[PDB]
Amino acid sequence: KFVLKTPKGTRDYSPRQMAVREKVFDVIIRCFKRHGAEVIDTPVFELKETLMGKYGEDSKLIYDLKDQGGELLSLRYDLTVPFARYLAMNKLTNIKRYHIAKVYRRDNPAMTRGRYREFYQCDFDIAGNFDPMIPDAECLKIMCEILSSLQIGDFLVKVNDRRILDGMFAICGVSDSKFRTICSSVDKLDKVSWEEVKNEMVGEKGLAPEVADRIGDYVQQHGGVSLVEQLLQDPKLSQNKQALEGLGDLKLLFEYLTLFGIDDKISFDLSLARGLDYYTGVIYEAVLLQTPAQSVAAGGRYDGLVGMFDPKGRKVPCVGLSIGVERIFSIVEQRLEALKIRTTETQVLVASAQKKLLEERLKLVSELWDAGIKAELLYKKNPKLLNQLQYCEEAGIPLVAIIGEQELKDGVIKLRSVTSREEVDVRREDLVEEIKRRTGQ
Amino acid sequence: KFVLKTPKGTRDYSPRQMAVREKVFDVIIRCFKRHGAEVIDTPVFELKETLMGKYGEDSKLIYDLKDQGGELLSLRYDLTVPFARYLAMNKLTNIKRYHIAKVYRRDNPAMTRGRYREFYQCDFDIAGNFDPMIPDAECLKIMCEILSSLQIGDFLVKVNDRRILDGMFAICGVSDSKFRTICSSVDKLDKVSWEEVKNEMVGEKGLAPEVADRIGDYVQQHGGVSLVEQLLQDPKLSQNKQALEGLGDLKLLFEYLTLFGIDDKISFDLSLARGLDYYTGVIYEAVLLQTEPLGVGSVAAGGRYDGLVGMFDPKGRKVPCVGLSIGVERIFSIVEQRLEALKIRTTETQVLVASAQKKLLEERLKLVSELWDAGIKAELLYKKNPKLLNQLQYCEEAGIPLVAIIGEQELKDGVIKLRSVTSREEVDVRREDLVEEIKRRTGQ
Numbered sequence A: 001k002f003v004l005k006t007p008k009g010t011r012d013y014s015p016r017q018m019a020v021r022e023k024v025f026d027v028i029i030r031c032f033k034r035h036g037a038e039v040i041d042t043p044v045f046e047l048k049e050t051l052m053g054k055y056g057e058d059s060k061l062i063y064d065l066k067d068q069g070g071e072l073l074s075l076r077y078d079l080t081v082p083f084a085r086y087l088a089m090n091k092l093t094n095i096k097r098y099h100i101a102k103v104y105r106r107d108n109p110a111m112t113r114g115r116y117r118e119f120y121q122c123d124f125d126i127a128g129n130f131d132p133m134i135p136d137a138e139c140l141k142i143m144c145e146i147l148s149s150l151q152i153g154d155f156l157v158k159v160n161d162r163r164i165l166d167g168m169f170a171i172c173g174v175s176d177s178k179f180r181t182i183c184s185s186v187d188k189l190d191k192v193s194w195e196e197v198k199n200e201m202v203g204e205k206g207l208a209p210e211v212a213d214r215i216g217d218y219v220q221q222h223g224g225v226s227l228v229e230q231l232l233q234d235p236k237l238s239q240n241k242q243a244l245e246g247l248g249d250l251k252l253l254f255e256y257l258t259l260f261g262i263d264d265k266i267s268f269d270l271s272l273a274r275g276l277d278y279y280t281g282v283i284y285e286a287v288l289l290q291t292p293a294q295s296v297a298a299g300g301r302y303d304g305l306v307g308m309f310d311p312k313g314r315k316v317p318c319v320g321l322s323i324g325v326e327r328i329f330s331i332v333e334q335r336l337e338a339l340k341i342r343t344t345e346t347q348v349l350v351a352s353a354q355k356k357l358l359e360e361r362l363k364l365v366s367e368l369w370d371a372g373i374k375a376e377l378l379y380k381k382n383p384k385l386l387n388q389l390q391y392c393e394e395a396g397i398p399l400v401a402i403i404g405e406q407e408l409k410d411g412v413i414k415l416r417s418v419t420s421r422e423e424v425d426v427r428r429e430d431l432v433e434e435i436k437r438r439t440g441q
Numbered sequence B: 001k002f003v004l005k006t007p008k009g010t011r012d013y014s015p016r017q018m019a020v021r022e023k024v025f026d027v028i029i030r031c032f033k034r035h036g037a038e039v040i041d042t043p044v045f046e047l048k049e050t051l052m053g054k055y056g057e058d059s060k061l062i063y064d065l066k067d068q069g070g071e072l073l074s075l076r077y078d079l080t081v082p083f084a085r086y087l088a089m090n091k092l093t094n095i096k097r098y099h100i101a102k103v104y105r106r107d108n109p110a111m112t113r114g115r116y117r118e119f120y121q122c123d124f125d126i127a128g129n130f131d132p133m134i135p136d137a138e139c140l141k142i143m144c145e146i147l148s149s150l151q152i153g154d155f156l157v158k159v160n161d162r163r164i165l166d167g168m169f170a171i172c173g174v175s176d177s178k179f180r181t182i183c184s185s186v187d188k189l190d191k192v193s194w195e196e197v198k199n200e201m202v203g204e205k206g207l208a209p210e211v212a213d214r215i216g217d218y219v220q221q222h223g224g225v226s227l228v229e230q231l232l233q234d235p236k237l238s239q240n241k242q243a244l245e246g247l248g249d250l251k252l253l254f255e256y257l258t259l260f261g262i263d264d265k266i267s268f269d270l271s272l273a274r275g276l277d278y279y280t281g282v283i284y285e286a287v288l289l290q291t292e293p294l295g296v297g298s299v300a301a302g303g304r305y306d307g308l309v310g311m312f313d314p315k316g317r318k319v320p321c322v323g324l325s326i327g328v329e330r331i332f333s334i335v336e337q338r339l340e341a342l343k344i345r346t347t348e349t350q351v352l353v354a355s356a357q358k359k360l361l362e363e364r365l366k367l368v369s370e371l372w373d374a375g376i377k378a379e380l381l382y383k384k385n386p387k388l389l390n391q392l393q394y395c396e397e398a399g400i401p402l403v404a405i406i407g408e409q410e411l412k413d414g415v416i417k418l419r420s421v422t423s424r425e426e427v428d429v430r431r432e433d434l435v436e437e438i439k440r441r442t443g444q
């Protein structure tokens, strides 16, 4: 019952999958850099106490390391808490960073295909005291740039504010003590019925039926900027100062989103409440829409988190986003299967048909390596030429440099195109340039 | 008091440290690709049983995950054992891959500076049944290409074979019982004197003086190919078949190393024995030399390990493998110290959209978004009415070369004042031309 296997909910990345990974990360990183972000990295684990008391009910899904006599450690559940720890530890107030790394969650979803316990997040976060809603709006612009550039079909970004959500709960009659647990039930509305949620709130979490009904009247609503204006003219909700400020900030957000040319991509949705306790202002999730045949990014503002870490409680406003690339890898692979990607970049194979020429091949391949050319040879004393061409056909190697007794005497090499099969004599001094000229370089 | 802290022996990477990291990895990866390697990645943990019984006495330094009801898991101690597992699980016999990732070891060294429990390894490994010593020789070529290209001073690569080493103890009269404990004492010769080791073998590990002396006659020796020929003509050692084969393979190795133009960088050193149990043929460590040069400590290592995939395969089928790993943690310090000797940026922003007047935030957001859409790397200060002086100071510190200044009159006229942060010269530029003009000034 030892079996060769990766741990439950984790996968290797094959060369083919790594090719796709690099392509997706390249689009994402090009965008993060375009917005002037620094990059950092943190250890894979933190102290156990670092991650406790931050996430909410999801804290039950953290991987702990064994108590081996030393410190109690835990694998990072996301990149944001480590970011807040980095800020506080270094006493920083202002930084704009991106971070691309794996995170660790003991999930148990119904779909067990793919990497559901160890998966990459691509984060971008702006920390600092700035004027209202500008960095918030930029985060939404970054999401839309990226999702558009990846070309993974049409998408929509749902938006809300935790102040609106919690103020709406107050008007409906939810006590302040239940804001987190009721907000948690509303987060399930993307997977379950309203009836199933309503029953959870009444039967299990102890709400009254009447107030759950009232929550439904708001939660079902979604639209654009006109909905914000509507709710500002709402008689009941306008009397809540908390909600009033959140709505006022979303009004400002939509002004900036329009100037960024992405107001058409945003849905103000009152059912959106994120899964994590630390959000204080805006929150958002992007979802892919279906074209006829048949969440991919998320984030928000979290102004309290660095304060929990600072010795003297000093706060540092932060807003950010994270892109879930695991779904995207499947989609991008399916696009390429629809249109043969290589997993090496070898430009040439040094080869020979005759015997007793391994030494000369090693000389030549090394010469090429020293000139920066991507070169290989078969690890054989006297390989057959047919096998050498087959190795190239399968790898996608475009050229073969063939050595023979006579060619060494003459100071040339036979250069054959793997795809056309045409062969040309090339002077050994010219070989490097000729290879570069043929392979894009 | 709650303590803000990274776990013992681990560090963050600052933006500045990441810039250095990218520079080093870029040299390394350019070389791995040049040799036609595929790339893979594996999870950070394996099953606990995957890593047990492979490394030797070092197995006592593995990080285990908590038993939380499910499987027993462990953080990877290196990249080679996961590689062997990848091969066996997928039933592969032939693959040439590189892998750059962090590894996890509960070390306790005297020096506590830096990342000593979580650190990167850059591995390259060739698996397959091939003709003798060709892939082995290529691994050594890769080490020398890389260490030269990083420009971290002069270096030397020590080389040996486990068959030579184990055959040599036998002729000196060490019982098969003690091969592991005596091999462990000889591994200390890169840090301590021969006398101190000899005293450890005699007094503490119970060896006879006469046989420890005999071990010294071999172990103290190091040189190039002539030493290999010397030992082949050795009357005692030539009678050991195991050692004879290892010497024969090193003879062949030096022939190929010469053709690769790196025979001058290799020292056949009999005092070299690596720390891991799984090596079967050649083994090697690279060490930086000081400015005979002495020897500062090791920066790359590897060898041939023909038994490891066999331990994983259900039916015991072996897959010969040879490889190397580059320890980049020492290299980061050296490369940083080189740059301190000669101001590296941590962003690539080409331009800051700016204004000196008030009521122009809207127009700045329009412009910066225009630029983003044209692929230009652009920023603005998150301020309604920022001061121009502060905007120029933000650029000076960040290394941003250009500032695009908007004013009421400039919008009317359809132009932008473009100012160079480093020269301080300002030119009017038509708004249509702005993207091209920025590109033309900041490369391409």
Ligand SMILES: N[C@@H](Cc1c[nH]c[nH+]1)C(=O)O
Pocket (backbone or CB within 6 Å): A077, A078, A079, A080, A123, A124, A125, A298, A299, A300, A319, A320, A321, A322
């Ligand atoms: N860390 C959050 C996303 C986020 C990034 N920045 C702010 N929020 C998550 O894991 O879903």
Ligand SMILES: N[C@@H](Cc1c[nH]c[nH+]1)C(=O)O
Pocket (backbone or CB within 6 Å): B078, B079, B080, B081, B121, B123, B124, B125, B276, B301, B302, B303, B305, B322, B323, B324, B325
């Ligand atoms: N895994 C070895 C190095 C190695 C790579 N390939 C063969 N050996 C180490 O960490 O020391």
